[PDB]
Each structure stands twice: as C-alpha cells, then as structure tokens.
Design a protein around this ligand. Structure first.
Ligand SMILES: Nc1ncnc2c1ncn2[C@@H]1O[C@H](COP(=O)(O)OP(=O)(O)O)[C@@H](O)[C@H]1O
Lengths: 459, 47, 600, 19, 459, 154
C-alpha cells in the first residue's frame, strides 16, 4: 500500500475552463486523483490528464466555478481513481461520483479496483453460447440476445425506451427448457426517469439485486463520463470475482457522448464528426468492451447501452460508433410509436451479431434461423410494396404484392405488438412466425429450404 | 437511390435549392392539372 | 543508457536526457518497462509513442534506450498461436500469469525457447559452401501442413563453417555458423527483422491466379488474385467481418494471417473456438485449420498506439512466410482503426491536420502498407515463389464512402468489394453493391478462365449486363409503375431478381452456403443465363406472331423450373459431391429445354 | 476552425518564446 | 568552380517528421542541399526549405527514419540542386531522385541545370499550332491537342487513365496531308502500373527514346517532390538544347500535391482549402508551364500530366488549381467506364484551349471546327434529354428529343468507343462525326453554316 | 500597350501586375484620352492575395482569402471613371475597367464574385448552359445587370 504522507499544494498556476493547472508539483503522476478545497470549504476532486516537468493539469469533476488562485488547497492522493467495491453494493443507490445517496453508509470495501480497468485477454475470453429469453417476440425471434452480448436500444426522444429496458429487467430469463444482478447507470436523466426505474425495480421485487448509479441532469457534466466506468467496474467485481451473472444497463449514452465532447472541446482535441473527439471510438470501446464471459469462471456481464439518436439520425456519430462496437442493436423508431404499437421495435435496421450461434438445434428449435430470415425478407418486401403503392395506387398491384401487404399488416399487429406485460416464450414466437409465413405459398418462401418447409409449413 | 450523389459544395447547395423549387412548382402545376381534370371528370360523370 | 520521463499527455510521453536516441528505436518507459517507440527528437528531448496504457507513469521515471527498432521475431512457433499488437503470445501470458487480464509491462519472448524442434538440414550444404540471404539450410516440422523453412536472414552472407546435423534443437541453440570477413555469425532458428522495413524480393511479378473465395459474388463477378489488394469499406452490419472470416476459413491460400486491429474482442474468441473444429484434408488425412493460420489480436479496448504496431506486425509475418514459398492471404479487419490511431496520436502531438483531422501522411502509410503485397520471386538460391494478398476492411462513418481513409484506400487497392447497408438490412448477404464494385484483375485472369473453364467468361459478361439493365429499368419503373414495360424488359427484370435472390446472396452459416466451390458457382450461373437466353428468345420470336409468349404465359407454364432454379443453392457439396451436383444441374437444363419445346 | 485556432495558439507560443 | 571545402555539421537541433532542423550553421543558403550520414553509415539527401539566423530546416528526401540528434553528420553542398543532364539519358531508367535503377552507370554530367527552372521570356515564346494526331476520336475530333500544349488527363481511382496515356504515347504523331521522345515521371505509382508502362514501351520498341523516372508508391514520399522537376529539367535540355520533340507524362500530380501537403503541414504553415498549402497554385504553375516552343529552336515540350480526383469530384483543390493553369483537360469519367466504354472520356466538361487554332483549312479539314461544335451541342442536348427521360419516361418525348437520344446512344457506341489498339486519323474521325450528324435533318444542325452542310452532309 | 504576366511568375509580380496596368491607365487618362483597360482575370489576383496572406501567417477569412480582399478589389475598381484632368488645358479623359472573374461555378458565394458584384456597375454573366449549347456570345440575360441605364437615357 501507499504509506508515505501525501503532499498538499497551494501552487495553482492558473485556471482555463474546466482545467486547473498547478505548478511546483513533486514528481507528478499521470492519471492520479487530486482533492481540492475552495476558500469557502467546498471540497472537489479532479484527475491529472497531463504532466510536464513540475506542472500538472487537473480536470475538476464538480467544476471550476469558484476556484481560487491563491487560497485553493490541493492534495495528490498518489494513485489513480481506484474505487471500493463489495458484493453488498447490490441494493444500494449511489451517485455518479460513487458516493451513497440512500442514507446508508459508505462502501465497506472488499477490494479497490482501477476504474480504468484492464482489457480481457482474448485468449481466455470465451465466445457466448447461451440465449437470454427477453419475452419480446420482436427480439427473441428475429434478434436474439445472448448472455454476455452487447445490445443497445437505439431510440429517440419521447419514445418508450425506458419502458422496454424496464420490461427486460423483469422478464429476462433463459430458454433452457435464474436471477440477474442488475447495475443501472442513470446518467443525464431527469428525476422522474430515475424514479421510474427505481420504483419499477421495487415493484418487481428485485431491488435487493439492483445497484443504481445516478447522475441527473442537474449534476456535474464531468462526472457523467466516469459513471459508466463505476457501474462496469462493480459489474466486473460481481461477474469475474464472485461469479454472479450481471446485467448492466447504461441510460442514454448520448449524455456520455455530450459530456465527452465538452471535455474534448475544453482540451482542444482533434475533432472527428459533429465536434466529437477523434478518439471517441476508443473511449467508447473502453466502456462497451467490459462485457462477455471469461473461460473458467461462471460469471458473465451483459450490456444494454441504450442511447438516444439525435434527430433520429442513424448515422450520427453516437449510434454510428456504437454500431461498430456492439453486437448489433434493437432500435426503436417513431413510425411504430406514432401508431400506438408497443414495443415500437423496428426489426429491419436491427441485427444481433451472435444470433447465428445462440439459436437452432440444441438451443431453441431447429427452424429458428430459417423462420427469422424469411420473416426479414417478407417484412422488407412489404415495406417496399408500400413505397411503390404510395405512388402507383392499389390498382397497380398484383396478387404477389398484396400478399406482402397482408403479411406486413398482420406481422406488425401480431408479431411486434405485445404490450408492457406480455411475456411470450421463444417457442411461441416461432409458432407465430409460421402463422405469418403460412400467408404465402411454399414456392415464395425462398429463404427456407424444402427440408424445413415440408415439416413445419403444413401444420 | 437515397441521394442524388452530388459531392458536397456551395455550388451543389445552390443547385439543389433551384432543383427543389422546380420540383415544387411541377408538383403544384400538375396538381392543378389533376384538379381541373377531376372537376370535368365529375362534370362529365355528372353529365 | 537511460533517460527520464519529462511529461505525459496520454499515449504520447515526452522524455529528456536522450540526446543520442534515434527515431523509431524502442524504449522502456517507467518502472514497469512499458514498450514505446520514439517519434520526434527535439534537442536532447524525445517524443515517445507508448504501446501500453500510460496511467501511473510519473515524471522522472527512467527511460531505457534500446538500439534495436520495433522488430518482429521470425521463426518456428508462430503458426497456431495468437499474438497481441506487438507480438507477445497471449497463450504464453495466460499460461504464466494465471490471470484473465493482460498485465502491463509483460516481457515475454515472442517464440518459446522450451520447444525442441525437429530440424533437418538441406543436405546440400558443406563447410566451405557460399550461402547468401534467403537461402534455406534446413526445415522444421512445425506441423503436418506447413513446413517451416529456416532461411539465412537478408543482409547476411558468407561461407558455411558449421551446420547442425539433423536432430532436436530449440530456438536458443546454434543451427548455422557462417563467416564473412573474419567476423563470424552464429544463427539460431529465429531471425529479427525491423517491422517497418520491407523484406527484399528478387522480382515482383504480375498476379495471374485467382484467390479462391467461398462466395458466389466476390468471385464470379469481382475476382481477387493471389498477391492482389482489395478493400471492403462496409458500414456496421454489412457483414464485412463475415466475408473476411469466410475467406479465411475456405480459400486456396497456404497461410492466413488475420489481424484484429481495433476489432470487437468477441470476434477473436469466435475464431479461436470455431477454427479448431474445421477440417481440411491434406493427403487423405483430416487436419485442423489452425495449423495453417495465425492471428493477431489488438482489440478496440486495448492501447490505441498498438494499432499501428499490430498492422505492421501482421504484414511482416506475412512477408516472412511469403519468402518461404507459401501463398499468404492476410486480412486486417479494420484499417480505419489504424488511421484512427494515427489521428489520435497526431492530435496529442499537436501536428497540423489535413482532411477531416487525419494526418497529411495518411496516404503515405497506406500506400507503403499495401505495396508490400504481391506475387514475387523470392530471394534465396532455392528459387521459391510466393505471394501476400491483403484483404483489408474499412469502416467509413455512416457508410459514406467519402472519408480520407476510404478515399485513399480506393486509390491504392485494385479490387473494390463495396457493401451496401440497404442490402444488409434485408439480410441480402453478402451485402455486395455490385454496381459500384469493380475488379481490375479481370483481364489478368481471362487467360486462367479460358484455360480451365472457357464457358465462365461469357457467362460473367451476360450476368453483368442483366444486372445493369435491371438497375437502368428500376430507376424509371419506380416512377412509371410497370405500365410501359415491354415483354423483353419484364423477363430481364424477373431474371435479374432470380440472379439477385438465388445467386448473389448466400447464408454463410449453413452446411451448404458456408463454402461454394467454383465449379458450382459457374454451373448454376450457366443455367440461370441459359434460361435468360431461352426465355428472351421465346418472346422475341413470337411477339410479332398470332400469339406472344408474355411473362405470364411462361411463368405459369414453367413455374416448376423457376422454383427448381431457386433450389439450386441447396446442394450441400460436402454431403452431395461434384458428381451429383453436375448431374442435378444438367437435369434442370434438360427440363428447361424440354419445357420450351412444348411451349413454343 | 480547428486548424485556425491551433495556428493562433502556435503563434502566441512562438511570440512568448521570443520574449 | 566552388573550389571551397564543404562544412559538415553534427549540430542537429531536432527531427520532426520529414524535416530535420539544424543549428549553428554558417551563412545558410536558401534551397541549398545537405547530405546526411546516419550513425549506421546510411547516406541520404535533403533540401533546405527555410533559413533563419544559424538555424535551417532541411527537407529529407529519402526519409528521416534512423536519424538521431547527436551523431548524424550534415554536409552542406554550398549550391542549389543543379542536376546532371545528358542527351544520352534516353534509353535509361532512373529512380525518383535521378539515380540509376537499371544497373547502368550514374549519368555523366554533360551539363548541369537548376531544377527550379529558368523562366522563359514570353516575348520569345512561340505559339503552338501543329496538331498532334493521337488516334483517339474523343481527342482528335473534338478536344484536339497542339504540339506544345498542356492538357492533363483527369480521372478518379479505378478508371483506365493509364491505358489512355499509354495509348497516346505509342500512337502519338502529327496530322499529315518524325516522332516524340518520352520523359515519364512516375509519382506514387504502384508496381503493377510501373511494369505496365515499362513493358508497353519495350514491346513497341520505344525504349531507344524513353527516359523513365520511377518514384513508386512504396518509395519515399518526399523524394517525389523533386521527381517531376528532374523529369522536366531533362525534357528542357532535350527539347531546347538538343532540338528534340519531347512528350512529358506525369503519372499523378495528386500524389505530388499530397507530398507538398505533408511538408506544408510539417512546417505548420497556414493551409487553404482541404489542408493544402496556400501556395499550391505556384508550385503547380512552376511545373505545368515548362512547355511550349521558343524562338530559334525546332524542338518542343508537350505535357499531358495525369491527376486522380479524390471523391470523383472536379472541385477538389488539386484538379481545381490545375484547371486554372493548364489549357483544358480530357476528364476521364466513371459513368462511361461502368458501361464498358473505352476510352471512357466525357466530352462535355473537357475542353482544349488551343483547339480553335490548331484545326481548319491548311491544318486538318475545312469543316473540322464546325463538326466539333455541332457534335458537342448534340451530345449535350442528348444528355439533357436523357435527364428528362429518366423522369417523364420514353413515352413523353417528342420526335426531336428521340433524334438526340438516338444520337447519344450511337455517338458513344460508334464515335467515342474505339479500343486501345486501334488508331483513327483526324479525317477518319470527322467522317464518323458526319455519320452521326447525318442522323439529324439539316435544319436541326444549327451550328454548321449552310455552305459546310451542302459540301459534306449529302455525301 | 499590354502587360504580360504568366501563372509561373512570382506571386508578388502576379499581385503587382494589376497595379502596374492601372497606373499606366491613369497616366494616359490624365492626357485627355479615353482609356479602356481589360483584365484577364481578377481571380488570379485574388489567388495571389490568398497565397501571400498564408505565407505571412495572417488571420484569413472565407475560403482562405484575406478579410481585406474586398478592399483591394474596391481600390482597383474605383480607380476609373470620366474625369476632369488636372492641368491648365482643362482636358477631360476617362478610364473604363473590364474585370474578369474566373467562375468556379454559378454560385455567387464565391468570395471574388461576391466582392466584385458589390462594386461593379455592369455585370455580364456568362451562362454555363448556353456555352454547352455553343450559343455565342454566351450571356445569361436574366442574372446580368447594368446600372448605367438612366445615365445613358439622355
Ligand atoms: N455473408 C454472410 N452470410 C450470412 N450471414 C451474414 C453474412 N454477413 C453478415 N451476416 C450476418 O450479419 C451480421 C453482421 O456481420 P458483421 O461481420 O458482424 O458486420 P460488420 O460489417 O459490422 O463487420 C453477422 O453477425 C451475421 O449474423
């Protein structure tokens, strides 16, 4: 451990935006944490993002409003932000800084883990080969979720992505025909959103297995880029040291991206798109890739990094860079919501990069993959038919086109529409798939081999 | 497909605005042609 | 022999008291001895690019100056192993630290020094013989698939003074002793080569042999060659990683070097799990794939600086095997992540950026990387022939093929496998656009195709014309509503759909589409084109008569043919071999010809 | 804008060194 | 004779990318040359970019890798890179710095010339007139090339601009009623292209009059900045002192422009559009304008530079600034290439400034000018008709529009399409022109005087 | 009497060429002669200003041009007009200036086109589509203007 006394400085050189620059610092350490007291007794903290000679640049989390130049007192802890972690954090509510806000005590640590974490050795990483039953046909059928998979929900302001995430928390099981520890990072949200989840977790009777981290809209914007790391760091303790299956949900990741963009502008870093740092991808990977199973240990971490798409722009850097890192997305839209369809999940622009291994013989039912692929073909074609019919009129369509409009209409109301408390099994979902596929003659089901049609289609 | 695929430029911006105005005028003029035909159609169907 | 750290800005560390340090020398920064490489020299201060996370590094930490530049260890023990971005074996780290995390500052030999290799000399050398760079003076049997040739390193030469007799030797022993001018050199099985320097060849030759890909499209329409360079600038979800994995699993290359530079960690695990379960018969015996592959993992959540070392380490390994007479087909599944690393470092360096924040020298790095590919005559008296192909992914933001990396890449690579996100959304995999893609090796392979097939080339041409005509029509049909279409155009539109749905797309996670032997691709294309010609003739000869064979007449009369043609993909070449597939395709051709005779 | 900002900052840095 | 010993310095200040900064230098000369000896004995060269006091910035041509800041020895030549030139440089292949790569000896210095160029007095410049008969109908018919012209070929990546340039080289000649020497500067050219041209010159027996300067894509990127100046310096010797006619081919000014950008960024210069130096215009003008004829000489230099257009545009600063300097272009398009048309040259955005004077009675045919204009207008209209057809359909065109559509299709098939191994004369090209013009009734050929129509049209 | 300066001449002479030309124009203007000065290009002059502005490391404005581009063009363009000359003879001469803005396109956002339009009284814009149709002289007739109508009405 660190036995040497820490030094306290009153040597602040100057302040520029959110960065407090100190001079005359003895052997500055990069990425060490500094605690500072303002002339009025206010305590704040920050991290050294740069060292040079006797100078060090400290980014203050709470902010730099009121920071003095002569009376400011800073001390260097001598290490990086290592945070206390314990098993009994489940059932506790923390803020974005890692402190309790539930009137309970501080964390009685079992160890201290580096918030930056470590990359998992790809040689010991074990490919996910287990399916989670979300109960939502729009997911379990056409975009299955594996245990250890990274699947954000791409949404837009005003859509019920918070209800879908809440629903998943209660009715997420296994298809092996199980209590997940949930870590919920509520960052950049209003009180009502955070209270919605907290109340739902108590309503579900699962609060003793839920750890919350809150950083609300009225909280500092710099803490909003450590909250995910605090949640995931706890998840790593639980999953990889205590072999507990953990589900980690990160609320609108766009508030993370905006908090990061502000820091990037403040430090004058090289922009990429829309003003975001050119290293945004690397930073997101640091957050996202803290997931998956590890060979030889019985734990797992599953992530659902839900994010709001600015102006429904699917190519915005936030969903774009996420789409490159995560194993696909669920993606909801306004076209379904504006018709009172719940869940408003649009399968066409969605995918699950692990689905090919989590379904089929020995996992669910051998026709699973075939049903999904044909449903995708029929759904997309029905959308193509509407795009045509909007101009040419119904009279310009033939029987080959009307079948896809019948499929599309029955598909959305039978397959996607369920309701907040409709919990379907994966087997029921496939049976529904067939009921829609039986709208077409065998010859048109061109994504399914005759070795499958001959067995399932007649029923 | 989704875009005309003209490289981003101030020249392209000007062209697209002129192209949009043309398309909007054509829409309105053809809509008026349709309305005139519809009245007569309804005139002739009434006859 | 040490400097001292002056400051840290992240992946870039500034050090002082390094007056004698040169560019691109390795250094050990910090008390954990982190690996880095000098980028700039300013007086007696050096700018160091560090390939490991710099958190915890203090001002005043020692910096060891190492005279050797960033280099790769080349010798037996590479194949079947997985390396990190600077050639530290992950199976050896995990076997020694017992951890699941990769520690920082790990000093592990690239190639194990405990293995007793089976070594046989060439039996053609004697003491007093004159040996030159690239000469092979023995072979090590790494496994049953790849014979590992022990070469005299380039920039070394002399007379042989001792050659190890056949026997069991490890990588720390002396196999060859040679002398030049008084100075004597003792060589083991492992040579060291700077990773940023191109290994020398006798002659760079034209590429005149296909690089077989287990795909119908990406082969029949847009061929790649041994030694060629291609890009796959797909948007997320387009399936470019699957195309890369498919090529790795099922190709006619001898060695695959797979570089995961900024790739998701789950993808490298998928290779390690799945590949050992694949088969490739050698001489009547079933063997695993991993014995002929090697892979480098530098995942997205690893140090960004290491992304540059990973790319160059991979291609350096590829050249090593190229020199031994093997055909290498490396693939780096990112490219954009490497250019991204260059941007992030350039930012920390406060360099003046060029287009979209990227360094001005982005094009210089890509050009010198891709030009290391190619079919070559090797250096070395034994007259080997090898190649390195590069199949590199690119990740344009938003799928917009306008970024400096996609733009620069397209000016370098000779094969363009463009992917269309709107095809992937429809699960039309592989999501190849087939309108913007091209291959500049068509003329080079025309000789090959005529020699072995002949029928393929006119089929390739007709298929392209049909797809182009469908696009030319689709543009106007969207506006007309299929009202003004001639009967000859309706046939084109429907056959073009037939080609699109049954020929260009295939499900790579099935027993029948996981690999598509070329003879099957050309076989089923011949039938589809033969239908086109017969259906088009049927209407052309009757349109002016007293009964025109419109689409609705042929469609109802030959509906069984159209379904059979669509079923042609479901042939499972592993269960049903060549004889049954050719006989089956011949039967469909006979069925079509007989139906037409009864129709017209 | 980004490049111009860095140009202005580099000019300021050069000026300070000259003093 | 500069019989003064050279100074060699170890007073290296630092190295930054392609730039080496030296201090304590006695009377630095601007644009001087420094020979660098690396600690391991490697020799390299560079040219001074600026001097100030006792400091100088050296541009290192071969690259800076391996240079330290303690032992590297810097020898100042005391002069400007004046390059050895000889009339017997033909039949030789040099690398990008003018050194032998063909196993021949170092060129013997018949004389030296300053590669920077010696400006030619516009009063003595002779206006070009004689037409070069390139064999390509897209050039000989419409955008003809005069001897001494400056007409670069624009193209984007992947188009057959190397085949067109090669075809022009072997088919070059004058309109008859003896041949060219080739100076070929390869800048950033891949090995596959390098052997393409080298083999084509050998197979056609041209090497007796070809001098190659090869800077390949895998060679140093700073060296290629002088490569084009070395090529033109030799062309100027051969054309203006040895009374030869020289055709100069520059394989890519875009890789050259990138090399300038790398240096400009390295010295933290204020950029203009897309990051390129604000002085790109001058750096190009000083190369492009090394062309034409001079009073008292019989030789000439004709330039046909090639430029790859990033993103398939023609507003990129590189082709934009070139267009302002050179006398028209060919502009190889992509829409023609995708349709298997060769040469895929688009006649509308491409012009030749000297065409109006290098044709007509006494040089080609009386009607040359009239045929060109009428064909151009017909093509332009046909494209506007095609643009309409794509919207209104083939059933919404009048009889005249169909004539232009028929012209458009037959024009590209019969006139533009040629093949790489067939040459056609200017008179054969015009006869084809007339075959296309005779599609229209005479009343519609409004750009041809009635006298011209009556002479040729009815034939 | 023409002034010859090619694109391969030094940027400083490229800038000064316009000033040399107009100096000769005013010289003869003061003789009572009617002088007509033709420019080949003012975009090349503006290009020289952009190149020098960069080399001097001064803060640029739109598209890399100096913020004072408009001042330089106004200074040149306003050195013209019918005048009463200095000197006892009471002679009266004139200078006409015909500028020439090379069009990167028909978008008048072009800093040089825009600054010129704010100064010049007559603008003879050349239409791209009429040029493509080989209709000569190619004049738009819709975007052009001349502000001397009322002056010439007399
Ligand atoms: N050729 C293919 N055959 C079958 N499925 C494919 C193919 N390519 C992609 N897919 C499916 O789509 C997903 C997306 O492919 P992936 O390689 O992960 O995308 P990316 O382009 O982002 O690398 C795959 O995980 C798989 O489910």
């Amino acid at each position: 451990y660190l036995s040497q006394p820490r030094l306290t400085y009153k040597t602040v050189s100057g302040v520029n935006g959110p960065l407090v620059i100190l001079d005359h610092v003895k052997f500055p350490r990069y990425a060490e944490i500094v605690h500072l007291t303002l002339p009025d007794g206010t305590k704040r903290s920050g991290q050294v993002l740069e060292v040079s000679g006797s100078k060090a640049v400290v980014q203050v989390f709470e902010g730099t409003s009121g920071i003095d130049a002569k009376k400011t007192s800073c001390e260097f802890t001598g290490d990086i932000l290592r945070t206390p972690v314990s098993e009994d954090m489940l059932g506790r509510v923390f803020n974005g800084s890692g402190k309790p806000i539930d009137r309970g005590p501080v964390v009685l640590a079992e160890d201290f883990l580096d918030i930056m974490g470590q990359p998992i050795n790809p040689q010991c990483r074990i490919y996910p080969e287990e399916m989670i039953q979300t109960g939502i046909s729009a997911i379990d059928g056409m975009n299955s979720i594996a245990r250890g998979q990274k699947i954000p929900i791409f949404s837009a302001a005003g859509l019920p992505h918070n209800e879908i995430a809440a629903q998943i928390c209660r009715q997420a099981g296994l298809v092996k025909k199980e209590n997940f520890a949930i870590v919920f990072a509520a960052m950049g949200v209003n009180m009502e959103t955070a209270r919605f989840f907290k109340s739902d977790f108590e309503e579900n009777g699962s609060m003793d297995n839920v750890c919350l981290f809150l950083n609300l809209a009225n909280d500092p914007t710099i803490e909003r880029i450590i909250t995910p790391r605090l949640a995931l760091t706890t998840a790593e303790f639980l999953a990889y040291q205590c072999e507990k299956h953990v589900l980690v949900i990160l609320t609108d990741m766009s508030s993370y991206a905006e908090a990061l963009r502000e820091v990037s502008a403040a430090r004058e870093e090289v922009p990429g798109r829309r003003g975001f740092p050119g290293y945004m991808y690397t930073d997101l990977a640091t957050i996202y890739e803290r997931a998956g199973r590890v060979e030889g240990r019985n734990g797992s971490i599953t992530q659902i990094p839900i994010l709001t798409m600015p102006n429904d722009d699917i190519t915005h850097p936030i969903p774009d860079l996420t789409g490159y890192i995560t194993e696909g997305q669920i993606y909801v839209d306004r076209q379904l919501h504006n018709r009172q369809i719940y869940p408003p999940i649009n399968v066409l622009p969605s995918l699950s990069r692990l689905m090919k291994s989590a379904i089929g013989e020995g996992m669910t039912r051998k026709d699973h993959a075939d049903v999904s692929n044909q449903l995708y073909a029929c759904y997309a074609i029905g959308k193509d038919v509407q795009a045509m019919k909007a101009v040419v009129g119904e009279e310009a369509l033939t029987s080959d086109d009307l079948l896809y409009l019948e499929f599309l209409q029955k598909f959305e109301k039978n397959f996607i529409t369920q309701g907040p408390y409709e919990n379907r099994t994966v087997y029921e979902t496939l049976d529904i798939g067939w009921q829609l596929l039986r709208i077409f003659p065998k010859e048109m089901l061109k994504r399914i081999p005759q070795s499958t049609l001959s067995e399932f289609y007649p029923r | 497909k989704d875009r005309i695929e003209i490289f981003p430029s101030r020249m392209a911006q000007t062209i697209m605005k002129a192209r949009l105005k043309g398309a909007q005028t054509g829409r309105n003029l053809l809509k008026k042609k349709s309305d005139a035909l519809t009245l007569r159609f309804r005139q002739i169907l009434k006859k | 022999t040490f400097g001292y750290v002056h400051g840290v800005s992240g992946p870039v560390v500034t050090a002082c008291d390094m007056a004698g340090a040169a560019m691109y020398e390795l250094v050990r920064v910090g008390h954990s001895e982190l690996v880095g490489e000098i980028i700039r020299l300013e007086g007696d201060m050096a700018t160091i690019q560090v390939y490991e996370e710099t958190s915890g590094v203090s001002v005043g930490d020692p910096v060891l100056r190492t005279g050797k530049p960033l280099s790769v260890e080349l010798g037996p023990g590479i194949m079947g192993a997985i390396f990190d971005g600077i050639q530290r074996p992950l199976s050896d780290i995990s076997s020694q630290t017992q951890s699941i995390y990769i520690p920082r500052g790990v000093n592990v030999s690239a190639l194990s020094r405990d293995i007793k290799w089976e070594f046989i000399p060439s039996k053609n050398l004697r003491v007093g013989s004159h040996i030159t760079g690239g000469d092979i003076y023995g072979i090590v049997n790494e496994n049953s698939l790849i014979k590992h040739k022990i070469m005299l390193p380039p920039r070394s030469r002399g007379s042989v003074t001792y050659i190890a007799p056949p026997g069991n030797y490890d990588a720390s022993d002396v196999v060859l002793e040679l002398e030049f001018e008084g100075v004597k050199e003792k060589l083991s099985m492992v040579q060291v080569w700077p990773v940023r320097q191109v290994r020398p060849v006798t002659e760079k030759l034209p590429a005149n042999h296909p690089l077989l890909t287990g795909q119908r499209v990406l082969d029949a329409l847009f061929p790649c060659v041994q030694g060629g360079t291609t890009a796959i600038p797909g948007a997320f979800g387009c399936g470019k990683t699957v195309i890369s994995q498919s090529l790795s699993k099922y190709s006619n290359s001898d060695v695959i070097i797979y570089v995961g530079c900024g790739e998701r960690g789950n993808e490298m695990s998928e290779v390690l799990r799945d590949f050992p379960e694949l088969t490739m018969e050698v001489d009547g015996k079933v063997e695993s794939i991993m014995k002929r592959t090697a892979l480098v993992a530098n995942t997205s959540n690893m140090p960004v600086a290491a992304r540059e070392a990973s790319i160059y380490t991979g291609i350096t390994l590829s050249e090593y095997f190229r020199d031994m007479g093997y055909h290498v087909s490396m693939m780096a599944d990112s490219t954009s992540r490497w250019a991204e690393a260059l941007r992030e470092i350039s930012g920390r360096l406060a360099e003046m950026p060029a287009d979209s924040g990227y360094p001005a020298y982005l094009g210089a790095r890509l050009a010198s990387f891709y030009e290391r590919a190619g079919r070559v005559k090797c250096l070395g008296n034994p007259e080997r022939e090898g190649s390195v192909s590069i199949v590199g992914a690119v990740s344009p933001p938003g799928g917009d093929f306008s970024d400096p990396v996609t733009s620069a890449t397209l000016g370098i690579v000779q094969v363009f496998w463009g992917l269309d996100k709107k095809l992937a959304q429809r699960k039309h995999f592989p999501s190849v656009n087939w309108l913007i893609s091209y291959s500049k090796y068509m003329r080079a392979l025309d000789e090959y195709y005529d020699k072995h097939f002949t029928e393929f080339v006119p089929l390739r041409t007709k298929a392209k014309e049909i797809l182009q005509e469908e696009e030319d029509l689709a543009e106007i049909v969207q506006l007309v509503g299929k009202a003004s279409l001639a009967e000859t155009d309706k046939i084109t539109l429907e056959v073009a759909k037939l080609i699109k749905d049954d020929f260009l797309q295939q499900n790579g996670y099935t027993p029948y589409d996981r690999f598509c032997p070329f003879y099957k691709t050309v076989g089923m294309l011949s039938n589809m084109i033969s239908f086109y010609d017969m259906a088009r003739r049927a209407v052309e000869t009757t349109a002016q008569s007293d009964n025109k064979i419109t689409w609705s007449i042929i469609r109802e009369h030959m509906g069984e043919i159209l379904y059979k043609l669509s079923s042609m993909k479901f042939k499972d070449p592993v269960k049903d071999g060549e004889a049954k597939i050719k006989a089956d395709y011949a039967q469909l051709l006979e069925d079509m010809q007989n139906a037409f005779r009864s129709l017209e | 804008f980004y490049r111009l900002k860095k140009i202005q900052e580099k000019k300021k840095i050069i000026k300070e060194k000259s003093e």
